[PDB]
Write a protein that binds this ligand. Structure first.
Ligand code: HEM
Length: 153
């Protein structure tokens, strides 16, 4: 469980993401796909993209990263009281998309990397620790839901 102060460090960097969620989503996907190329294979609509240039030029990938980061932002704004938001996300990710916990760890690492590069004003050591705690909570709670749903993760 995160303290209020830790949540405020999470929300204060998220406020900067929200100046341009689409651009942050593009940087996070490009980071994820370059660092862990196997993750791109889970996206039927995007697995043909061959280069960072193609990923940046994809209007559909840009829209997807706005949907993904906005869903994450809604979770983080609940400050751990995210049961309702996790239910549909867990169900789709366990049963339709089949996204292992290790891949949620990879996207968490990409989110952290991008915030570290873009936002040193709001993403010093303490703020990064708070964001990691929040992402670790998310992944713990998703993994519990996965198990209830029948998926190993
Ligand atoms: C912070 C973690 C993540 C969040 C908040 C998130 C959120 C979302 C949301 C809101 C959608 C659309 C609704 C739905 O189908 O549930 C979606 C779709 C999808 N997500 Fe996730 N996602 C996350 C991580 C991942 C990761 C790591 C992968 C794969 C490695 C993944 C694969 C997919 C796929 C394949 C779809 C369908 C994409 C399409 O329509 O073309 N997601 N995600």
């Amino acid at each position: 469980v995160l303290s209020e102060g830790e949540w405020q460090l999470v929300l204060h960097v998220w406020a900067k993401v929200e100046a341009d969620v689409a651009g942050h989503g593009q940087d996070i996907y490009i980071r994820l796909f370059k660092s862990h190329p196997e993750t791109l294979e889970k996206f039927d609509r995007f697995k043909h993209l061959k280069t960072e240039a193609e990923m940046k030029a994809s209007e559909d990938l840009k829209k997807q990263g706005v949907r993904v980061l906005t869903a994450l932002g809604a979770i983080l704004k609940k400050k751990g009281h995210h049961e309702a938001e996790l239910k549909p996300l867990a169900q789709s990710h366990a049963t339709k998309h089949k996204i292992p916990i290790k891949y949620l760890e990879f996207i968490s690492e990409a989110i952290i990397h991008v915030l570290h590069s873009r936002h040193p004003g709001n993403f010093g050591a303490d703020a990064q620790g708070a964001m990691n705690k929040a992402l670790e909570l998310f992944r713990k709670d998703i993994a519990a839901k996965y198990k209830e749903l029948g998926y190993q993760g």
